[PDB]
Design a protein around this nucleic acid. Structure first.
Lengths: 56, 119, 115, 122, 229
RNA sequence: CAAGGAACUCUGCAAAUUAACCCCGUAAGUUAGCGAGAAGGGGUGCUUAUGUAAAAGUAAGCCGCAGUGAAGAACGAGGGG
RNA sequence: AGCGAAAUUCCUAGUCGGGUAAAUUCCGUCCCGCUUGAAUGGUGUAACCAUCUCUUGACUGUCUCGGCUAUAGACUCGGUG
RNA sequence: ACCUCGAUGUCGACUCAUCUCAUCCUCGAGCUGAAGCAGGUUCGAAGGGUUCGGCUGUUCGCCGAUUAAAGAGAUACGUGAGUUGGGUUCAAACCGUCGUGAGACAGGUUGGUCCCUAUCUAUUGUGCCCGUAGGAAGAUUGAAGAGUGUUGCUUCUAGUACGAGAGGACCGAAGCGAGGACACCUCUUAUGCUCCAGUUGUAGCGCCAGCUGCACCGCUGGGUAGUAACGUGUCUAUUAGAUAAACGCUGAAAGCAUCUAAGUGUGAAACUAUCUCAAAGAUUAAUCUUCCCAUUUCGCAAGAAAGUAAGAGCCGUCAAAGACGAUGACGUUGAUAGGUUACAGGUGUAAGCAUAGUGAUAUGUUGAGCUGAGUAAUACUAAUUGCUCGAGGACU
């Protein structure tokens, strides 16, 4: 249960190709003027109308 | 398993649950995992809904949920709670609280959720 | 869609002994046992104590013991079961709702008829 | 679900007490026995007042099973004990003093010598 | 053919006692009188088949293509739309009761996708034997044993295509056949069957007419509880 | 892990049965020190009263399905070499 | 002498018996023992054995026969790597 | 001794096996020194099947037991990056031997340390990028496949035939199996680590009480949701087509006859279909139909701004799904999960209270309490108030 050769860069990156990625959630923030990822708190301490969190 | 980690097990979880429910009593606010915040919240709602018969058996049982704190005790939290908190919540059909989605950890980049509730 | 599961009981309503004599899973009962080898319902009674008893409907079941010829007779029946006529005769007593001990215990140990 | 190298009583007086399967005859990998099944069995327990020596091998049918077996009707028939009785190559048993009333899910498979040799069948 | 089919929901499993004083396997299945959606001749779309519309719902709770054609054919919007070949004699948009498709004691076959078991072992997928414990087997005490296919450039040195190997277990459409129909309640849109039936509660299960004993319609009365007072 | 019970094997390795106390008892051999926890068994909780300074222990009552109430304790027996 | 098919007997799956439903191993017997063989002593020896090894009581997931609960992973994240 | 010694795991065991049929048995047939019965002989004939227990590393061997059989060969005496290691194969000790002796002994006596992290390929399951040629939506289809395609018994049939006498049919019917396999939990198990109960003492909880840890989760026993078989159901049919052997018919040669030559058939567990699944990336890209869709105006003509409305995605509430992917549900226009409720359900009368006993408890309060998961309702909380893509048929 071992490797025999080393590889060539292109096939490495091909394995890595459909090892692709995906992005963040996204919503808007106007209770404090940002754009948070969807279904979270915003940058400001608020998760919608009220500051559900402290300043920092 | 090589005499290393036992990790997470139901007794550890339930001990943490009892401790942090005692905590939120002391505070009314916890910054935990949702997977744990909501999980606690079911038993929390149970206790809330059941706390308001306000009897000595209620005392003897809610005894089974607390310890010594930096802030409160059994005798202090229990009493204050019984005195003032319950009826303002006696009229709604469950869902007493909110777990709300903060940002994730720094220590592990894991999604911290805040468990709280306001009258 | 609308899954109610009351329908279970709604259809069970057609084979249900309406009187369902109560007892304990340690209660001494008897039953008239229909005997139709190919003919002529007779009655062999298999008295004895109920051993276990679970109730949820037609899947109500229970066990009864006898001890004859140094031979223990342990037969499970369905509580709701046609050709089964039930009589509770003398009530036993145990504060545990599933036990096994008397299947292997000697005499002179009968519990009191429940006062 | 009764198979080889499982010893049980000799539930019929012939002069033996204990007996173990040596083979469950007939169907290959049937590998089980149930009430009404006849198999060949070696006796290791015998008295001189009977007619058998320990080590003989003959054919017996299991009448009782600590595991029990379900009635056709559904009354979940069971026993506390696994008993077997020896027959002489036919539904005539080799033992005759009936120790407890014998099973009833065998009658159709014959054995009615025994089912008659008892004031009741259980 | 005359393939009588029906869509139900696995809404109970119990036991019942019948004539000849014998226990009957009981599978409770919720089945409303459904409505075919489309019928095609062996010459219309080149095969004689019928798709049926079932689980009738509100209009705007489904794709607008699907609801659009529901109203294009002007039939009841049923979230489910499933076809079977061999039968087209069911007039366009025919809300139908199955007491006409099925009688109370005959045989049918019951297609129901089974328990989705997730990934499986072969000892339960292909249902093999577990290893022994003594004499040393180590951690590999539960393995495929010999799977050598070829040694040397003249045996095989490869692996069998199509080979039985574990994977996601259960959870594909399968049928249980020769199960007797037991009884109906169109008032409750419900039915009883015998058997031991693949699939969970809540799912819709298809039932065709039996492939072995459809010409076998045989009742033995359900014995009610005898003594009552 | 129900149900057996070693069928496994080259083979009971494993694995389990065993264990504490009080008390009973133990074969043959044997060279007479043993064997011998040989073999093989019973009681065991509490309330009372009694036991004495302490208790082994007694009797009565009580209670359980059951009381080294969980920790922790030898598993035999024979054969030959 | 002795013991003898043996920790050492080709024949040999010698013999007889036990053991064994049924036993190329075993125990006891019988001995033309290929070269057994009395100071590498013979031939036994009570005990005893992390000694061999036979039978055999409990005991058993060793087994049939397959499987359930809890976690350690493995699996996911994120890092380190 | 070819060819690897700058290195080829080779015996047996177990497993997976599989494969050739010169087939044991299960299908048929043919012929008989084939009364029946039981045979023999010969073939078609691999669909499937063909056991266990003891003796020895050891299959082979023997045995004891049979059953439709316990078939024979083949794969590095297949099969250790599949497992042991029993032994012949470690040094180690000894015995019969031999050597003069150390030593050697297909002579024995006692045992003596199995590395792997998968690069690929194969192959399983399956996710995605793109295709399938306006977009979105379903429905298909079946190129090409896969399987299952085993059997015994009870009863009649019928002591009937046959034979003679015993004995004992041919054929078919029905059942019952075994096994063996897909499934299911009502049973029944076992599990059911946040259901419940007794529950020891020790450290806790100012004291009784009443509960906690800790000890397997202390022990013990139940037990819901569920899990899982040892549980139960189904399944083993039936059919057509092609037929093998085989039997034909007509009818030759060879005035005949001759199943062949032409003509016409019949005939096997084997074959094709009948059953199931799965399938059009089947680039073979197929098909049916559904919805949507055309907002002045640039380009070797597409849109320079209206970019779906058809839908899809992301986010989430999630579960039957689930390694994850993903499949599914739906997201406030919401019942998705939870909570709230009511019940189920089982643990099986709670605490506390008063009575009694001296108390170990009983008493009645009490089917009481309780209830991880069920059921079914309640917008009470969270399922976001969002963003992203997503229209103009270019061309036959």
């Amino acid at each position: 249960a071992v490797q025999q050769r080393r590889s060539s860069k292109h096939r490495r990156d091909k394995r890595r190709s459909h090892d692709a990625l995906t992005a963040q959630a996204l919503s808007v923030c106007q209770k404090c003027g940002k754009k948070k990822l969807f279904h979270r708190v915003c940058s400001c301490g608020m998760y919608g109308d009220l500051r559900v969190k402290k300043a920092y | 398993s090589y005499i290393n980690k036992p990790g997470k097990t139901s007794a550890w979880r339930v001990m943490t649950v009892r401790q942090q429910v005692s905590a939120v009593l002391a505070y009314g606010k916890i910054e935990t995992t949702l997977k744990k915040a909501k999980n606690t919240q079911k038993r929390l709602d149970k206790l809330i809904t059941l706390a308001k018969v306000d009897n000595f058996n209620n005392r003897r049982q809610v005894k089974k949920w607390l310890l010594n704190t930096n802030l409160f005790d059994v005798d202090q939290l229990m009493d204050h709670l019984f005195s003032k908190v319950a009826p303002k919540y006696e009229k709604t059909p469950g869902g007493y609280s909110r777990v709300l989605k903060l940002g994730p950890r720094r220590g592990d980049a894991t999604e911290m959720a805040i468990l709280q509730l306001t009258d | 869609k609308i899954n109610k599961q009351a329908l279970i009981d709604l259809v069970e309503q057609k084979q249900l002994k309406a009187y369902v004599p109560e007892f304990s899973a340690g209660d001494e009962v008897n039953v008239a046992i229909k005997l139709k080898e190919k003919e002529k319902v007779r009655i062999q009674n298999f008295t004895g104590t109920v051993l276990r008893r679970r109730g949820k409907g037609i899947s109500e079941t229970f066990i009864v013991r006898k001890t004859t010829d140094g031979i223990p007779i342990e037969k499970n029946f369905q509580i709701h079961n046609p050709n089964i006529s039930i009589e509770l005769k003398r009530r036993g007593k145990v504060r545990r709702a599933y036990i096994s001990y008397m299947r292997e215990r000697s005499g002179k140990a009968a519990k009191i008829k429940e006062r | 679900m009764v198979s080889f190298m499982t010893r049980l009583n000799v539930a019929d007086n012939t002069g033996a007490k204990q007996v173990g399967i040596i083979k469950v005859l007939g169907s290959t990998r049937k590998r089980y026995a149930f009430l009404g099944d006849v198999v060949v069995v070696s006796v290791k327990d015998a008295i001189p007042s009977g007619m058998v020596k320990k080590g003989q091998v003959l054919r017996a049918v299991i009448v009782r099973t600590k595991k029990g077996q379900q009635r056709k009707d559904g009354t979940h028939l069971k026993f506390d004990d696994n008993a077997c009785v020896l027959i002489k190559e036919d539904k005539s048993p080799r033992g005759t003093r009936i120790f407890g009333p014998v099973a009833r899910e065998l009658r159709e498979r014959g054995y009615n010598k025994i089912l008659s040799l008892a004031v009741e069948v259980v | 053919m005359e393939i009588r089919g029906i869509f139900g929901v696995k809404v109970g499993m119990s036991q019942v006692f019948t004539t000849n004083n014998e226990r009957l396997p009981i599978t409770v299945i919720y089945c409303e009188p459904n409505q075919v959606a489309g019928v095609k001749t062996e010459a219309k779309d080149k095969y004689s088949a019928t798709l049926l519309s079932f689980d009738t719902v509100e209009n705007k709770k489904l794709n607008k293509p699907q609801q659009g054609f529901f109203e294009k054919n002007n039939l009841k919007p049923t979230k489910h739309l499933q076809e079977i070949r061999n039968m087209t004699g069911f007039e366009m948009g025919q809300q139908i009761t199955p007491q006409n498709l099925f009688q109370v004691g005959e045989y049918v076959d019951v297609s129901a996708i089974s328990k989705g078991r997730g990934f499986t072992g072969a000892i339960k997928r292909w249902n093999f034997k577990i290893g022994p414990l003594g004499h040393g087997a180590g951690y590999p005490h539960r393995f495929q044993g010999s799977v050598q296919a070829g040694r040397g450039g003249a045996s095989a040195q490869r692996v069998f295509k199509g080979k039985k190997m574990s994977g996601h277990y259960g959870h594909e459409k399968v049928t249980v056949q020769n199960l007797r129909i037991v009884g109906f309640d169109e008032a409750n849109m419900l039915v009883l069957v015998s058997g031991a039936i693949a699939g969970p509660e809540g799912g819709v299960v298809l039932i065709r007419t039996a492939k072995k004993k459809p010409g076998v319609v045989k009742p033995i009365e359900l014995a009610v509880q005898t003594e009552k007072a």
